[PDB]
Write a protein that binds this ligand. Structure first.
Ligand code: ZN
Ligand code: ZN
Lengths: 626, 551, 35
C-alpha cells in the first residue's frame, strides 16, 4: 500500500514497497554521477594534475583544484548513495536484484545499515556484479588517495561554489568506496533464482523474476498476492539482442506497475549509432590513429564487438589488433560464453551444435582478439601503436582509461569514442578539456524508449503506473518534444527523491483454503443462483488461512401461503382483521402474538417442545440458508 | 476427485521406463525409456495403449524427459515421429545438447546389428528435437491454463533434473535417477519441503576410499611405467574420472601423459565446459581463476595403435564392436601390459545411483502421503517398501508393469474472505470463538462475504428469532440479575470483560436484558434472541441451570 | 450439496481416454498383445 522511493536517479532506482505483512526493497542503484565532480585518479601521477592550479577560498586553496573554469574536488572520488535514512533498512526483509547495474552499492545496505534479511538475483547478474564491484574496488585501491577535502561539502561553500557543484544533491550522504572484504560479506547473503521461478515469502507473498531482455541475467520482477499483483519494470529490450527475448504476456492484468530504466537521450537509434561508431574507428585507423572506447565488461561491449568484427571483416580492416584491458576481462568473456541458456533462441540453436555461442572464442584461438588483466601484465610488451582499446570505467575518474587518454590526449590523430548512456560526456571531458583529441559522443542505449514503453502499456493496459518525475517531464535538452512523453489514460502519478507514495489499490480480500466436508455441509436451494452458509474454525500457520470444522437466518415467509398453512393446520381460535399499522392477529392457542409492521419484524415462540418442533418444521419448509 | 496412474515398463524391473499419468484429465508423459536385448521390437512402449493409431497430440499435451540416458529417453524418436506426435515436449537444455549424438550413435550401433528395418532415422530425430522445447532449472513454466511444470536439480548426470508437477492443490513428483551422494563434478539433488500427494522414485540400490584406491593404483602403474586403459561407456563416470585424474596429476605436479580417444568424448567435454552451472561448486568457483576442463592431458592421436605403451591413461568407448577395437590388439599380451576394467583387475566403477539411505533421506525430506516405486530390482523395491512401512507407517505402492494405480485426493476450494472479518478473527484468536461462514455462488468462482457486507446486495430482509425463557420465582428482578451475572462470570472463567449501560451482560453474541411482561403482572417473562450456533449453547446452558441450582 | 455440485463440475472437465485402461482388469495391462 505504501511505496518509498530513495534514489532520485531515473535509471538507478532505489525503492521500498510496503506490501501487506511484508516489505520489499526493490533495487540498490548506486549513483555514479557524483564522482564526476572529483579529480580523476591516474594510474601514474601525471605532471598536469600536480601543476594544476587550486581555487580561491576565503576561509587554504589545497582543498580544491580548478580546470577550464570548472572547480573539481582534489580528493578520492565519492559515490552518492540512495537516501537510505528515510526508512529503517533493518526492517526490510527482501531485496530483488534486477540487473548487475542496479545491484551496485549493495555492500552499503547489507553491512552499514545492519540489514539481516535475504536477497535474490539471477546467476549472471551475481557473477557480472561481482566482476564490476571487484574491478571498481581495484581501480580505487590501485593508487590510494587521501580524503583530503571535506570542508567543501558544507552548504555555505556549495552556495559559494558555481553551478557544476551547486547542482549536486545530498552531498553529505556521499560515501567513500567499500572494500573487497565488504563485497565478500554482502554476496554471502544473496540467493540465486532463475527466470520465472516462483519464490514464496512467509507463505504470504509470491515473487517471480521474468526475462527483461536487456542484458543476460537482467530480470523484471513481479509481486503477487493472488487477488493483488504488483509488477516492477526495469531495463528491458525488445530489439534483436543476444539475451533471452523480453517477456510481455506475464505482466498483464497487473494492478500497480512501476516503471524504471528508460533510455537516456531516447532520440538515439542504437543501430545507426553502432554503424557511425564503426565508421569513426574505420576512418581513424585509415588515418593511422588509435581509438579508445571506455565501457563496462557488460553486454554493451559484447554486441559492440560482435558488430565491430563483422564490420571490419566486411571492410577488410582486420589487420589492427583488438585490446580489451580490465582486471576481469578474461573472466567476463568466459562468463558470457558459458551462460548460453540465458541468451536468445539463435544462440540456443547455435549451442545445440557443439560450437560455443559467441564467435570471439574463435578469434581468441586464432589470436585475432587479445585481452590482458592490466597494462603492466605483459600488455606493454605486446602493445602496438595502431590499435583500438576498450578499458577503464566510463566515468573517466579511474580505471586504465585515465592513463590511456592522458597518453593519447595531446595527439589530434587519435580518437576517443563514448558508448555508455549514463553520464554527460561534456562533464567527463571537463577535467581534460584542453586537448586536441577528437571526441565523439555516440551512446548506444538498448533499453526501452518512450514509444516502446507506451506501446507496451497500450498492449497491457495496467490500472496504475508509477515512475520518476523525470519521465513525466520532457528532457531539459529539448523541452519541446512532446512525442517523447509517456502517455497514460490513468493519471500515472510520479515522485521525486525521498518521496513517499501511497498506492491507490485498496483490495480487501485474500485467499483461504477449504476442506471438502465443509463444502458438503451446504444444501443449496434454487431461488431464481445458489445459496450457502457454513460455520468453521479459522486456523492459520505461515500466513496460510485454513478452514476446518471443530450463520444468519432469512426466513422470508409470504403472508398468503402462511395463512393457508395455518388454516390447514387446524389450530383453533383463528381471527383475521384489517386495521392500521399493518395487520395484527391475536392467537390464544398458546398466548402467541404475530405482528407485521414495515421495516420491522418480531418473532415469538414458547419453550414447549412440541410447539418448538412444529415451528422448526414450518420454518424449514421455507428456509433460505443465508 | 481421482488420480489416474498406470506406468508401463520398469515398474518391477529396470529399463523401458514409461509413466503415463492423467492427474486432472491432462495427460502427462513423464518418461519414454527402452531396454536393450529386446530384439523382438519390445524396446519401445506400446503406442497402441493410448489408442490404436491416431494423433498422439490429441491425447497428450505434455512430455517430460529426465536425462540423456537411453533407459530414460531411448524410445523418444520412434514414439514421437513414427507414431506421429508434434505436441509440446519439455526437458532441460543440457539434456537437449547431450541427447541427439547419443541417440544417433545408438541408432548406428543398431544398424550394425542389421535390425534397422523398423528403427529410427537421423532426419526424423533432428526434426523432432528441433521441435522440442527446452526448460531451465527451477523454471516454473505454465504449460497449460491450470498445469505447470517445475524442474529440480538431480545431479545424477549433467543436465539431469527431477520434475514437480502441480495443478490446483494436486501435486505429483517424478525423479528418475538421482543421488544424495555428490559426485566429484556434480552437485547433490536438492528440493524444498514440497510435500506432494505422490512421489515416484527409483529402487535400484566409502566413495572417497574407493577414489583413493583408484588413484593410488593408477599412480603406481604410471610410476612403474605400465600402460592401463579404462574402457567405460558411461559419459558421466568418464568425465568424473577425467576430472579426478586431471586434478590429481596437477596436485602431484608431475607431467605424465593422459589422453582420451573417441571424438564423442571431445563433444561431451565441449558440452560440459559450456554448461558450467549444472556442476559442482568447486567448478563454478574455479571458473573465475581459469577453465578446469582444459588441461595438458588432452586428446589422443596415438599414431593409430603405433605410439607404443608407457605411463599412459587412456579412455576407450567400444559398443559390441564399436570404437577403435584394435586397442586390445596393440596392447595386452603380457602381465606388464595391464588392462583394468570394472596384470590384475579391480572394480573401479562408481555407483552413480544412490543407495537405499539416499531414498530414505529424500522421502523423509519431502514427506509425501503416498510414494510410487519403479526402475529397480523386484527384491530391492520390496525390501525398501517393507522398510518404509516399518519406519514411517506412510502409504506406499509396488506397481507392476501396466498396473493401474488410483489415488484419492482432496481438492481444496479456493474462495476469498472479507478483510474486516479476517482482521476480527485474528484479533479474537490472538486474545475458543468460532467464525461463521456465508458464501454466494459466483460466475466460475465462489466468494465468502460477511453478514454486514452481504447487505450491500440490495434486498436484504433480516429476520431474527427471539425465544422466551420462563422462570417462576418470588425473588426480585435486579438482585437476581446481579446474582446471575456473578454466577455466569464465575462459570465462564472470566471470558466476559465487557458491560452494557442498561444493566445487561452479553457473552459472544447473545444479549441478556430485563424486560417487563406484556399484560400479566402475576408472571415475569424475559426475551432472549440468538442464532442457531448460539441457540444450541443457550439451550444446553439453560438445561444445565434447570438441572440444579442453590434454590 | 455444494461439494457434490463442485465435484460434478470437476468431473465434467473430461477429455479422451485410453483403450487399455478401459480393457484393464486386475489393473495390470497388456503391451504388444500380438506378441
Ligand atoms: Zn536414469
Ligand atoms: Zn541415469
Amino acid at each position: 500500500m505504501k511505496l518509498y522511493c530513495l534514489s532520485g536517479h531515473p535509471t538507478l532506482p532505489c525503492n521500498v514497497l510496503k506490501f501487506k505483512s511484508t516489505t520489499i526493497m526493490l533495487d540498490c542503484g548506486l549513483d555514479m554521477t557524483s564522482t564526476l565532480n572529483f579529480l580523476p585518479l591516474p594510474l601514474v601521477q601525471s605532471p598536469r594534475l600536480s601543476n594544476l592550479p587550486g581555487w580561491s577560498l576565503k576561509d587554504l586553496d589545497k582543498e580544491l583544484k580548478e580546470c577550464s573554469g570548472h572547480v573539481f574536488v582534489d580528493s578520492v572520488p565519492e559515490f552518492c548513495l540512495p537516501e537510505t535514512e528515510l526508512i529503517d533498512l533493518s526492517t526490510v526483509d527482501v531485496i530483488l536484484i534486477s540487473n548487475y547495474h542496479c545491484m551496485m552499492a549493495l555492500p552499503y545496505i547489507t553491512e552499514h545499515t545492519g540489514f539481516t534479511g535475504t536477497v535474490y538475483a539471477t546467476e549472471p547478474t551475481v557473477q557480472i556484479g561481482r566482476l564490476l564491484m571487484e574491478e571498481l574496488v581495484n581501480f580505487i585501491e590501485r593508487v590510494p588517495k587521501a580524503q583530503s577535502a571535506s570542508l567543501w561539502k558544507n552548504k555555505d561553500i556549495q552556495r559559494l561554489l558555481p553551478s557544476p557543484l551547486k547542482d549536486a544533491v545530498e552531498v553529505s550522504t556521499w560515501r567513500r568506496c567499500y572494500t573487497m572484504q565488504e563485497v565478500n560479506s554482502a554476496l554471502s547473503k544473496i540467493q540465486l533464482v532463475g527466470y520465472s521461478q516462483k519464490i514464496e515469502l512467509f507463505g504470504a507473498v509470491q515473487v517471480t523474476p521474468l526475462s527483461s531482455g536487456y542484458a543476460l541475467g537482467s530480470s523484471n520482477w513481479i509481486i503477487q498476492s493472488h487477488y493483488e499483483k504488483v509488477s516492477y519494470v526495469s531495463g528491458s529490450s525488445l530489439l534483436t539482442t543476444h539475451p533471452q527475448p523480453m517477456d510481455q504476456a506475464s505482466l498483464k492484468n497487473s494492478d500497480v506497475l512501476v516503471l524504471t530504466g528508460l533510455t537516456q537521450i531516447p532520440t538515439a537509434n542504437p543501430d545507426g549509432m553502432v554503424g557511425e561508431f564503426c565508421s569513426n574507428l574505420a576512418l581513424t585507423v585509415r588515418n593511422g590513429g588509435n581509438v579508445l572506447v571506455p565501457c563496462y565488461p557488460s553486454g554493451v561491449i559484447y554486441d559492440l564487438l560482435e558488430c565491430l568484427y563483422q564490420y571490419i571483416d566486411s571492410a577488410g580492416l582486420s589487420s589492427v589488433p583488438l585490446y580489451f584491458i580490465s582486471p576481469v576481462a578474461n573472466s567476463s568473456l568466459e562468463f558470457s560464453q558459458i551462460f548460453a541458456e540465458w541468451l536468445c533462441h539463435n544462440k540456443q540453436s547455435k549451442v545445440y551444435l557443439p560450437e560455443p555461442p559467441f564467435p570471439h572464442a574463435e578469434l581468441i584461438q586464432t589470436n585475432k582478439l587479445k585481452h590482458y588483466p592490466s597494462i603492466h601484465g605483459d600488455f606493454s610488451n605486446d602493445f602496438r601503436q595502431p590499435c583500438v582499446v576498450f578499458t577503464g570505467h566510463p566515468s573517466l575518474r579511474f580505471g586504465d582509461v585515465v592513463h590511456f587518454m592522458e597518453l593519447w590526449g595531446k595527439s589530434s590523430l587519435n580518437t576517443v569514442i563514448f558508448t555508455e548512456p549514463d553520464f554527460s560526456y561534456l562533464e567527463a571531458l571537463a577535467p581534460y578539456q584542453p586537448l586536441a583529441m577528437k571526441c565523439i559522443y555516440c551512446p548506444i542505449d538498448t533499453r526501452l524508449n518512450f514509444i516502446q514503453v507506451s506501446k507496451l502499456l497500450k498492449e497491457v493496459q495496467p490500472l496504475h503506473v508509477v515512475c520518476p518525475e523525470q519521465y513525466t517531464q520532457p528532457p531539459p535538452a529539448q523541452s519541446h518534444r512532446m512525442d517523447l512523453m509517456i502517455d497514460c489514460q490513468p493519471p500515472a502519478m510520479s515522485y521525486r527523491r525521498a518521496e513517499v507514495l501511497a498506492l491507490p489499490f485498496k483490495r480487501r480480500y485474500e485467499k483461504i483454503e477449504i476442506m471438502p466436508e465443509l463444502a458438503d455441509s451446504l444444501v443449496p436451494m434454487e431461488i431464481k443462483i445458489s445459496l450457502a452458509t457454513v460455520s468453521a474454525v479459522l486456523h492459520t500457520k505461515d500466513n496460510k488461512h485454513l478452514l476446518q470444522p471443530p450463520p444468519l437466518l432469512s426466513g422470508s415467509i409470504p403472508v398468503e401461503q402462511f395463512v393457508q398453512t395455518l388454516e390447514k393446520h387446524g389450530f383453533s381460535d383463528i381471527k383475521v382483521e384489517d386495521t392500521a399499522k399493518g395487520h395484527i392477529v391475536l392467537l390464544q392457542e398458546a398466548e402467541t402474538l404475530i405482528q407485521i409492521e414495515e421495516d420491522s419484524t418480531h418473532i415469538i415462540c414458547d419453550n414447549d417442545e412440541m410447539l418448538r418442533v412444529r415451528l422448526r418444521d414450518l420454518v424449514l419448509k421455507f428456509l433460505q440458508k443465508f | 476427485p481421482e488420480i489416474r496412474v498406470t506406468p508401463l515398463g520398469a515398474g518391477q524391473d529396470v529399463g523401458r521406463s514409461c509413466i503415463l499419468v492423467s492427474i486432472a484429465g491432462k495427460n502427462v508423459m513423464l518418461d519414454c525409456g527402452m531396454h536393450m536385448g529386446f530384439n523382438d521390437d519390445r524396446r519401445f512402449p506400446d503406442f497402441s495403449y493410448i489408442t490404436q493409431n491416431g494423433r498422439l497430440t490429441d491425447f497428450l499435451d505434455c512430455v517430460i524427459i529426465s536425462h540423456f540416458h537411453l533407459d530414460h529417453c531411448g524410445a523418444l524418436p520412434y514414439f514421437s515421429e513414427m507414431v506421429g506426435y508434434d505436441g509440446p515436449i519439455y526437458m532441460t537444455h543440457p539434456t537437449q545438447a547431450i541427447c541427439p549424438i547419443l541417440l544417433e550413435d545408438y541408432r548406428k550401433i543398431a544398424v550394425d546389428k542389421k535390425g534397422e528395418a523398423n528403427f529410427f532415422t537421423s532426419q526424423m530425430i533432428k526434426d523432432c528435437m528441433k521441435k522440442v522445447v527446452a526448460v531451465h532449472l527451477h523454471q516454473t513454466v505454465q504449460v497449460d491454463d491450470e498445469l505447470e511444470i517445475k524442474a529440480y536439480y538431480a545431479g545424477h548426470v549433467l543436465g539431469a533434473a527431477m520434475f514437480q508437477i502441480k495443478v490446483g492443490s494436486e501435486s505429483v513428483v517424478y525423479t528418475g535417477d538421482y543421488n544424495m551422494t555428490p559426485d566429484r563434478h556434480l552437485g547433490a539433488a536438492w528440493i524444498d519441503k514440497c510435500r506432494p500427494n505422490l512421489l515416484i522414485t527409483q529402487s535400484t540400490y566409502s566413495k572417497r576410499c574407493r577414489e583413493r584406491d583408484f588413484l593410488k593404483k593408477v599412480h603406481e602403474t604410471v610410476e612403474r611405467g605400465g600402460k592401463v586403459l579404462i574402457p567405460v561407456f558411461a559419459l558421466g563416470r568418464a568425465q568424473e574420472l577425467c576430472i579426478l585424474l586431471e586434478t590429481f596429476w596437477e596436485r602431484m605436479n608431475l607431467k605424465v601423459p593422459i589422453y582420451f580417444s573417441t571424438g564423442l568424448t571431445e563433444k561431451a567435454n565441449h558440452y560440459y565446459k559450456l554448461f558450467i552451472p549444472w556442476t559442482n561448486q568447486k567448478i563454478r568457483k574455479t571458473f573465475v581463476q581459469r577453465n578446469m576442463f582444459e588441461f595438458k592431458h588432452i586428446k589422443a592421436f596415438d599414431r593409430a595403435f603405433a605410439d607404443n605403451p608407457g605411463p599412459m591413461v587412456v579412455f576407450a568407448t567400444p559398443g559390441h564392436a564399436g570404437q577403435s577395437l584394435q586397442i586390445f590388439r596393440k596392447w595386452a599380451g603380457n602381465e606388464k601390459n595391464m588392462v583394468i576394467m570394472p596384470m590384475q583387475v579391480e572394480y573401479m566403477s562408481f555407483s552413480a545411483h544412490a543407495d537405499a539411505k539416499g531414498i530414505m533421506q529424500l522421502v523423509g525430506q519431502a514427506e509425501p502421503e503416498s510414494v510410487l516405486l519403479v526402475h529397480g530390482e523386484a527384491k530391492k523395491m520390496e525390501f525398501l517398501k517393507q522398510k518404509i512401512e516399518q519406519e514411517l507407517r506412510v502409504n506406499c505402492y509396488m506397481p507392476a508393469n501396466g498396473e493401474t494405480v488410483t489415488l484419492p485426493t482432496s481438492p481444496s476450494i479456493p474462495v476469498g474472505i472479507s478483510l474486516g472479518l479476517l482482521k476480527r478473527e485474528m484479533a479474537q484468536g490472538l486474545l475458543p470463538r468460532l467464525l461463521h461462514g456465508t458464501l454466494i455462488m459466483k460466475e466460475s468462482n465462489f466468494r465468502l462475504v460477511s453478514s454486514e457486507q452481504a447487505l450491500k446486495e440490495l434486498a436484504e430482509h433480516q429476520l431474527r428469532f427471539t425465544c422466551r425463557v420462563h422462570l417462576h420465582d418470588t425473588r426480585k428482578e435486579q438482585e437476581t440479575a446481579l446474582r446471575v451475572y456473578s454466577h455466569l462470570k464465575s462459570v465462564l472463567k472470566d471470558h466476559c470483560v465487557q458491560h452494557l449501560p442498561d444493566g445487561s451482560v452479553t457473552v459472544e453474541s447473545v444479549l441478556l436484558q430485563a424486560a417487563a411482561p406484556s399484560e400479566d403482572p402475576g408472571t415475569k417473562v424475559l426475551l432472549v434472541s440468538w442464532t442457531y450456533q448460539d441457540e444450541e449453547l443457550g439451550s444446553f446452558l439453560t438445561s444445565l441451570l434447570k438441572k440444579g441450582l442453590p434454590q | 450439496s455444494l461439494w457434490s455440485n463442485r465435484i460434478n463440475t470437476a468431473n465434467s472437465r473430461k477429455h479422451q481416454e485410453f483403450a487399455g485402461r478401459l480393457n484393464s482388469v486386475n489393473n495390470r495391462a497388456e503391451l504388444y498383445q500380438h506378441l
